[PDB]
DNA sequence: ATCTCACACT
DNA sequence: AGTGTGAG
């Protein structure tokens, strides 16, 4: 019943904000945000401290408008190189945190600031080492048990009541107990998070459950600077009022279609349907996935992959800034290829691998789709001038304009991506 | 006028 | 190999 693994998800709190607060002490414990391309309406916000969220500041907001909502908002700007945002500082801090997490167990890098952890073997080790010894609440100073307490008005008071109920109810005698395994997982995650904060300064949240989807959902339940354990038995109560769209992979069109076709709102309602009924509407794979997921069962593995499988660089050119001349297209392809060259040379030196295929993608003014065209070619020698020339070669036939010097329709996006790594 | 990543089809 | 989808 989806209890074969113990999986955690560790996600950093306001990651880019914490990076900037580490760098600049003036930003600590203040409402602040990270910004991009300041000239247009003060820049687009990409990260927001929890103090700023209390005022209603959100990501994707223009900085000028956030300043309208939060006049004391402090701002840190993403580095800009070659006319575009440069995330090196955050990638390096991410690597720092991934390296600390890698000492405890195999991790799967799920984004710049979160990784999944398969803790099964660590749990087995810690249960044989920790033979029948009771687990003290002191080992879980920041852990919430979702669904408890049940059956007095402060947040931490409730947390402690729930943790006491949890440890009181389940015994260490049977070491195949899923709930005990989850609890040992949570102890390990407390240790991991303490190590991360000690060695980097960054605080983070985590979810501990039996699979990746529940771990991700749990992590968000008690942000920030806390962790949440979602037990198998907690799933029905958790899911009974949990919107479908909150579940990983159901936040888009498929989730909307599940809501529309089945006439439900919450994840638990999926349980009433048989597997073959769900496979009828959503296909064998989606039907079986929904059928298992709504009961708290998921098998997607924590992949042993800390490093990205591709290295890409994209820039949009919206509205009047769209690229309309051949000279413009070649210059921006060069800029993208130069950043790509830097990141690729560093990647080969750090990670002992080389990309062998270059993917070029563009968008044309008018196309509603994010990408209009994607093509490929050989990738050799990590040379920005060569890569940019090859990209121009592979897209040049897309220029409708009869005049060679002009490009039409204007380009609203450029994308270079290195793929197909070899040792 | 909000950029990277993954993977499932075909 | 190219498109659509989901996410963070
Ligand atoms: C959704 C999104 C996130 N990010 C960055 C901002 C975050 O710093 C980083 C981590 O994603 P997140 O964990 O979902 N958000 P957060 O890390 O800022 O904060 P928290 O984990 O919710 O506390 O991803 C983007 O750069 N473009 C985006 O569209
Ligand atoms: Mn985060
Ligand atoms: Mn994240």
**Residue A127 near ligand 1, beta carbon < 6 Å:** no
How far is it, in rounded angstroms, from Cα A13 to Cα A48? 10
What does the block give as tokens for A277?
């009924």
Is A220 near strand B, with its CB below 7 A from some atom of it? no
Residue A318, C-beta contacts closer than 8 angstroms, at least 6 positions apart: A412
Pocket probe mutation, ligand 1, options A17, A47, A90, max atoms within 8 Å of Cβ: A47
Is A103 near strand B, with its CB below 7 A from some atom of it? no
Q: Which of A371, A359, A325, A306 is nearest to A94 (CA)?
A: A306
Pocket probe mutation, ligand 1, options A9, A10, A11, A228, max atoms within 8 Å of Cβ: A11
Quick one: resolution in A?
A: 3.0
Return the sign of the alpha-carbon dihedral for residues A360, A413, A382, A89: negative
A16 CA: nearest ligand 1 atom: 8
Q: What's the CA-to-centroid distance between A251 and ligand 3, angstroms?
A: 15
Dihedral Cα A135, A140, A144, A146, nearest 10 deg: -30
Alpha helices, DSSP H, located in A71-116: 88-102
Is A321 near strand B, with its CB below 7 A from some atom of it? yes
Cβ proximity of A207 and A196 under 8 Å = no
**Which secondary structure element, helix H or strand E, spans residue A363, and what is its range?**
strand A354-364
Residues around strand C, C-beta < 7 Å: A 11, 110-114, 216, 247-255, 357, 369-371, 373-376, 420
The CA distances from residue A97 to A102, A311, A351, A413, in Å, are: 9, 20, 17, 32
State, as a whole number of angstroms, the distance between the CA of A138 and the C1' of B8. 45
Dihedral Cα A281, A284, A285, A286, nearest 10 deg: 10
Residue A147, C-beta contacts closer than 8 angstroms, at least 6 positions apart: A162, A231, A233, A234, A237, A238
How far is it, in rounded angstroms, from Cα A154 to Cα A255? 36
Q: Going by CA atoms, what residue is nearest to atom 10 of ligand 1?
A: A113
How far is it, in rounded angstroms, from Cα A396 to Cα A360? 11
How far is it, in rounded angstroms, from Cα A93 to Cα A18? 10
A50 CA: nearest ligand 1 atom: 23
SS3 A224: coil
**Which secondary structure element, helix H or strand E, spans residue A418, and what is its range?**
strand A406-422
Q: Which of A18, A11, A10, A122 is nearest to A76 (CA)?
A: A18
Secondary-structure breakdown of chain A: helix, strand, coil percentages, each rounded to the nearest 5: 45, 20, 35
DSSP single-letter state for residue A298: -
Q: Which structural domains are found in chain A, ordered by start?
A: 1-13+84-243 (3.30.70.270), 14-83 (3.40.1170.60), 244-301 (1.10.150.20), 302-423 (3.30.1490.100)
Give residues after which chain A gaps, C-N over 2.5 angstroms. Answer: 151
How far is it, in rounded angstroms, from Cα A97 to Cα A109? 11
Dihedral Cα A55, A61, A62, A66, nearest 10 deg: 0
Q: Which ligand is nearest to the CA of A223?
A: 1
Q: Which of A274, A170, A255 is nearest to A213 (CA)?
A: A255
DSSP single-letter state for residue A365: T
SS3 A130: coil
Give chain A's largest Cα–Cα span.
Answer: 81
Cβ proximity of A9 and A116 under 8 Å = yes
State, as a whole number of angstroms, the distance between the CA of A376 and the C1' of C3. 14
Q: Tokens 């560790």 sit at which residue?
A: A10
State, as a whole number of angstroms, the distance between the CA of A162 and the C1' of B2. 41
Is A309 near strand B, with its CB below 7 A from some atom of it? yes
Residue A414, nucleotide of least CA–C1' distance: B3
Per the DSSP assignment, residues forming a β-bridge with A115 are: A10, A109
DSSP count for chain A of H helices, then E strands: 13, 16
SS3 A123: helix
Cβ proximity of A49 and A17 under 8 Å = yes
SS3 A342: helix
**Which secondary structure element, helix H or strand E, spans residue A76, and what is its range?**
strand A74-77
- CB count in 10 Å sphere of residue A366: 9
SS3 A355: strand
Cβ proximity of A251 and A45 under 8 Å = no
How far is it, in rounded angstroms, from Cα A112 to Cα A301? 19
| Positions of chain C reached by protein Cβ under 7 A | 1-8
The method of structure determination was: X-ray
Q: What's the CA-to-centroid distance between A148 and ligand 1, angstroms?
A: 29
Cβ proximity of A258 and A266 under 8 Å = no
Neighbours of ion ligand 3 (CB under 5 A): A 11, 111, 113-114
Dihedral Cα A200, A202, A205, A206, nearest 10 deg: -10
Q: What are phi and psi of A230, to 5 degrees?
A: -110, 105
How far is it, in rounded angstroms, from Cα A400 to Cα A394? 14
Alpha-carbon A158 to chain mean position: 29
**Which secondary structure element, helix H or strand E, spans residue A185, and what is its range?**
helix A178-200
Q: What are phi and psi of A177, to 5 degrees?
A: -75, 120
Cβ proximity of A142 and A346 under 8 Å = no
Neighbours of ion ligand 2 (CB under 5 A): A 11-12, 15, 113
């Amino acid at each position: 019943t989806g209890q074969d693994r113990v999986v955690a998800l560790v996600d950093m709190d306001c990651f880019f904000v914490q990076v900037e607060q580490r760098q600049n002490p003036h930003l600590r414990n203040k409402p602040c945000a990270v910004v991009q391309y300041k000239s247009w309406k003060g820049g687009g916000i990409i990260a927001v401290s929890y103090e700023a969220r209390a005022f209603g500041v959100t990501r994707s907001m223009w900085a000028d408008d956030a300043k309208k909502l939060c006049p004391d908002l402090l701002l840190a700007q993403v580095r800009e190189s070659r006319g575009k945002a440069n995330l090196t500082k955050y990638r390096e801090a991410s690597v720092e945190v991934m390296e600390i997490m890698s000492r405890f167990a195999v991790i799967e890098r799920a984004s710049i600031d979160e990784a999944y952890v398969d803790l099964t073997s660590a749990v087995q080790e810690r249960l044989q080492k920790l033979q029948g010894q009771p687990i003290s609440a002191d080992l879980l100073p920041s852990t919430y048990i979702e669904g408890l307490p049940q059956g007095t008005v402060q947040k931490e008071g409730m947390r402690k009541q729930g943790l006491f109920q949890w440890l009181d109810s389940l015994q260490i005698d049977n070491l195949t107990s899923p709930d005990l395994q989850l609890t040992v997982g949570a102890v390990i995650v407390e240790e991991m998070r303490a190590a991360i904060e000690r060695e980097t300064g960054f605080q983070c949240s985590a979810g501990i459950s039996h699979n990746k989807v529940l771990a991700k959902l749990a992590c968000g339940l008690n942000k920030p600077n806390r962790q949440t354990l979602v037990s198998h038995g907690s799933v029905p109560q958790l899911f009974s009022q949990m919107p479908i769209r909150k579940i990983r992979s159901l936040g888009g069109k498929l989730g909307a279609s599940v809501i529309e076709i089945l006439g439900i709102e919450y994840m638990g309602e999926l349980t009433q349907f048989t597997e073959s009924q769900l496979q009828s509407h959503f296909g064998e794979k989606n039907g079986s996935w929904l059928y298992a997921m709504c009961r708290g069962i998921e098998h997607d593995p924590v992949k042993p992959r800390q490093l990205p499988k591709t290295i890409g660089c994209s820039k949009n050119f919206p509205g009047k800034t769209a690229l309309a001349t051949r000279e413009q297209v070649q210059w921006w392809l060069l800029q993208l290829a130069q950043e790509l060259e830097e990141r690729l040379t560093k990647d080969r030196n750090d990670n002992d691998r080389v990309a062998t295929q270059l993917v070029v993608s563009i968008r044309v003014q008018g196309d509603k789709r994010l990408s209009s065209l994607r093509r490929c070619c050989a990738l050799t020698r990590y040379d920005a001038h060569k890569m940019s020339h090859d990209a121009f070669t592979v897209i040049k036939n897309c220029n409708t304009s009869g005049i060679q010097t002009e490009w039409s329709p204007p380009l609203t996006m450029l994308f270079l991506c290195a793929t197909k790594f070899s040792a």
